[PDB]
Nucleic acid binder design. Structure first.
Ligand SMILES: Nc1ncnc2c1ncn2[C@@H]1O[C@H](COP(=O)(O)OP(=O)(O)O)[C@@H](O)[C@H]1O
Ligand SMILES: Nc1ncnc2c1ncn2[C@@H]1O[C@H](COP(=O)(O)OP(=O)(O)O)[C@@H](O)[C@H]1O
Ligand SMILES: [K+]
Ligand SMILES: [K+]
Ligand SMILES: [K+]
Ligand SMILES: [K+]
Ligand SMILES: [K+]
Ligand SMILES: [K+]
Ligand SMILES: [Mg+2]
Ligand SMILES: [Mg+2]
Ligand SMILES: [Zn+2]
Ligand SMILES: [Zn+2]
Lengths: 531, 531
DNA sequence: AGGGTGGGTAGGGTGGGTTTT
DNA sequence: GGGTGGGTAGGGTGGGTTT
């Protein structure tokens, strides 16, 4: 990836107009990181790819150069729902922009074809779906005449990861986008994406066959976010009492988001928050757009303070004043938590990202990812983040962002960097060998053990048939033992076994593959605990 | 890829039943290459991947091992249309096999669930779509019960390339198949595909979590095939006259296939064969499936001695006695020609694969391949194959199948190996310098040159506005002028320019990027012609 | 929006228990 | 069907091009 330091300057001939346009029509004071760098590249008539997290400010990077240059700027966008969002703010700001898709009516298409060749037109941005390029000979005909007339001057490829079959949401219609610049060379092209893997970019650069393209990446770090992991209470009705105590005590009157695992959690937390005086909402997949668009308005217009949903929020209008993102259960992966929690504090003021870590959540979510090839493995990354108490939460998230994460320091903006004066590391081998005793007795008695059943027999609870006749209880609180077993699960000394039935996939605990290392007398397993 | 030499033996303990089941139940005489090798690996309880060309006989490699083992063998298949084709052959040989999909009737699922646990069941093969694994908790429950009862013993994954997001026709449900051996470890799995690229295969091994896996590839070479390229006549009436004299002269009474470029050509060649006494074929994409299944029966029962089909003549075509594959125009790529022409001579007797090369075809196909990644580059591979007159056609086909093509010799069954003539190299610079003078004069007058307009002005015909006022005609046949210009097009001394209009993609010829090398008086471009 | 000693051969998966198109 | 018949104009579900 190229170095953008040499482009963060305001001495170009267009710098006078870009700074003018930035403040008076877009109503923004300064540039976000790499906004100025990328804008300088497009106005100089060269190719640029921009990697920036969702909500980073990618929309401005091709809207602004259109307003200080002539013609329209063509924006390739994968979805109509996203294109309508862009038109709502562009037409709000007094900028003339329109959109074209397969569903556009007959009367509307005639009006835009008219404006695409009128030199006296005010149209500066024309959004189209990739079908309008590959599967429309007519639109390609009008682009050809507009290019000959110097009316088609810039190209914008939003969500450029769809070019590569390596990147998520690969569209076969998106691979055709290489045809634009080969026949329209004088028009600059810009690519935008949230996916950071470099090899997907280079494949997009080959399909979008300009190899000599500058590639800028913004710092995926959000310094105004505070990350924290709290233990999830065993009793649910006591937990939701603790939620209101935190909302009222910390975030009184400020809007936020609550992420839950399942749809039944999303609704039950909503109505149980409303009864306690917190205006809540649900955003989980089904109902009628009309009856789950109101909740968007009610949250934007602040009739409701929190939106308790399951994961499909996708809610940036930049939602600028989001002060807190509390998770009821952990997200499926680290790339899911960063995306979901990263929607807070878009005003760059201090916002909180709170994750509630529950031992029961590990196995219910693990049971459902068994059809994602790396599902449990991505989940264990999230669980490792939860049980980790000694490292900066920002550094744990950074391990998934190798190419796009800058080394900027936490500066005491995580749970672990303020609290937690120094540690000690203790041996936990005997507890691991103890757990094998209950699992080996279960194999002898043809009994299968749920995670709950394993703790019970360990403590001296549950079926006496499952008890180890001479094994003594560990004399530790149940919250510590739920963190001991999960460590053995992450460390692969214990493994998850799944049983498929008609209703659901239920997770059991069985002896792990690394338990044979305990036959070695010199083997030692350790955990980092508090001294 | 692993070496199957140590496995090409019939002295294993199960070999007594293999020879019996192969000849007495499947009613076939001899194993095809790698059929015996792969079966020996499966019967030893080891996972194996088999790469074999389409129509090579990979289907037998999991049908036979089911008959020598207890219980059924589970076959993962991507399409209902493919499973129905196999079940027809399964029913006629007297082996009980069934299939399951989302459209299966409520009565049918209740019957198969019963057989999946009946120790006295006759069922030996159970075909399912990937939805029955990923999106069916109930079928997974019964697969789970069948595994404990030792009735579920083998796993078959047909079209395994769909697991990888790199391979064509990718299904997201195929990435979930990693659960099969993850939860059914004692059951062996076999993977099958027609795509040979190694990175897709290694991805499939990780997707289904078998890193320890044998990988066999069959020789994509078909020695019984004769490859030939003939020049296409200018008049379409004389071409069909030359086609009929080929069927009558060489291929009297035996069935074959004719592939055409366009849908209009398929129906025009059809009716022109009927009037000349040739039993027609009519294969297209837009007619009712009733018609699609008709042309198969009349072709299978030899009521028609040809199916003059378009691209996608519809493989699961399994007709062994196809003695000729005449192409009316060239295929889109080399990977497409091998697939289309390879459907001849499955009885291992000498069949001909003849391609007709037309100068007008180069640009008609170019207009449809310039809209998708890379194919115009793939199209030039075919044109290079056509104009090549000194190299074995088997070597030209081999260059696209590097990893899976054995160096076994042609033995004089291709167009270039029987011509027995060789030639020196002649200079063609003046003709290239001549063509540039006409292309630059057209650009000065703001006129664009079609391929036809370029030939006319060169010969001294066509519009006088386009003549050079000198540059007296080359006095060579138009057949030479077509192959000289196309050679300059491959060598990039000429390039294709496209104009998009409301009805068509029109290809034009313009000065190429390598024309600047002709400013050097020492530059020489040469062509090989016949001596 | 139930629980798994209530059962999965006659109870079935659109009856319900687990997130995006 | 043909492109000097035209595309600020007639529209592409009217037809000239691959599953
Ligand atoms: N410099 C800025 N100051 C304030 N808001 C900005 C700035 N740049 C962009 N934005 C806003 O960020 C919003 C979302 O950015 P977007 O491009 O949607 O990110 P994604 O896509 O990634 C836009 O509505 C835009 O108004
Ligand atoms: N061992 C064999 N001997 C003779 N013919 C065979 C043998 N195996 C397969 N075939 C024939 O090859 C034809 C196509 O093979 P198929 O299994 O469809 O390949 P795919 O799968 O790829 C079938 O009609 C079948 O009759
Ligand atoms: K039930
Ligand atoms: K027309
Ligand atoms: K029930
Ligand atoms: K019931
Ligand atoms: K017309
Ligand atoms: K007309
Ligand atoms: Mg965006
Ligand atoms: Mg097959
Ligand atoms: Zn920190
Ligand atoms: Zn040869």
């Amino acid at each position: 990836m190229s170095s953008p330091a040499s482009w963060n300057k305001e001495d170009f001939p267009w710098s006078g107009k870009v700074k003018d346009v930035l403040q008076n029509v877009f109503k923004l004071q300064k540039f976000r990181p790499l906004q100025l760098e990328t804008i300088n590249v497009t106005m100089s008539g060269k190719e640029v790819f921009l990697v920036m997290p969702t909500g980073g400010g990618k929309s401005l990077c091709y809207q602004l150069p259109a307003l200080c240059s002539d013609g329209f700027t063509l924006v390739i966008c994968p979805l109509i729902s996203l294109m309508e969002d862009q038109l709502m703010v562009l037409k709000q700001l007094g900028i003339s922009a329109t959109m074209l898709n397969a569903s556009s009516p007959k009367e509307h298409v005639k009006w835009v074809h008219a404006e695409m060749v009128n030199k006296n037109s005010k149209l500066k941005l024309i959004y189209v779906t990739p079908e309008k390029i590959a599967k429309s000979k007519m639109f390609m005909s009008r682009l050809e005449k507009a290019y000959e007339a110097r009316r088609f001057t810039r190209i914008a490829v939003d969500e450029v990861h769809c070019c590569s079959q390596w990147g998520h949401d690969f569209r076969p219609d998106y691979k055709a986008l290489g045809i634009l610049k080969r026949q329209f060379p004088n028009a600059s092209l810009i690519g935008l994406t949230a996916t950071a893997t470099s090899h997907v970019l280079k494949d997009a650069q080959k399909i979008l066959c300009v190899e000599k393209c500058f590639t800028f990446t913004a710092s995926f770090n959000r310094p105004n976010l505070y990350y924290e992991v709290r233990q999830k209470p065993s009793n649910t009705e006591d937990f939701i009492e603790d939620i209101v105590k935190l909302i009222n005590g910390r975030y009184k009157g400020q809007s936020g988001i609550i992420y839950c695992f399942s749809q039944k959690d999303s609704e039950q937390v909503t109505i149980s928050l409303q009864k306690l005086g917190i205006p809540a909402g649900a955003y989980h997949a089904n109902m009628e757009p009309e009856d789950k668009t109101k909740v968007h308005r009610r949250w934007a217009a602040n009739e409701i303070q929190v939106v308790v949903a399951t994961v499909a929020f996708g809610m940036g209008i930049d939602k600028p004043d989001v002060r807190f993102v509390i998770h009821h259960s952990m997200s499926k992966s680290m790339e899911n938590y960063y995306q979901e929690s990263g929607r807070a504090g878009r005003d760059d003021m201090k916002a909180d990202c709170i994750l509630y870590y529950g031992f029961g959540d590990i196995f219910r979510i693990s049971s459902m990812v068994v059809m994602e090839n790396v599902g449990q493995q991505k989940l264990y990354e999230m669980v490792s983040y939860c049980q980790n108490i000694n490292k900066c939460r920002r550094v744990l998230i950074a391990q998934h962002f190798d190419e796009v994460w800058s080394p900027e320091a936490c500066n005491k903006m995580c749970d672990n960097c303020c609290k937690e004066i120094s540690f000690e590391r203790k041996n936990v081998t005997a507890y691991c060998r103890d757990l094998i005793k209950i699992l080996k007795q279960a194999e002898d008695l043809n009994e299968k053990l749920t995670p709950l059943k394993l703790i019970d027999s360990w403590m001296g609870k549950g079926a006496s048939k499952l008890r180890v006749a001479g094994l003594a209880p560990p004399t530790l609180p149940r919250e510590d033992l739920e963190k001991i077993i999960a460590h053995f699960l992450i460390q692969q000394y214990l493994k998850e076994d799944y049983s498929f039935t008609a209703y659901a996939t239920i997770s059991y605990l069985k002896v792990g593959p690394k338990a044979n290392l305990l036959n070695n007398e010199a083997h030692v397993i350790t955990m980092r605990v508090k001294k």
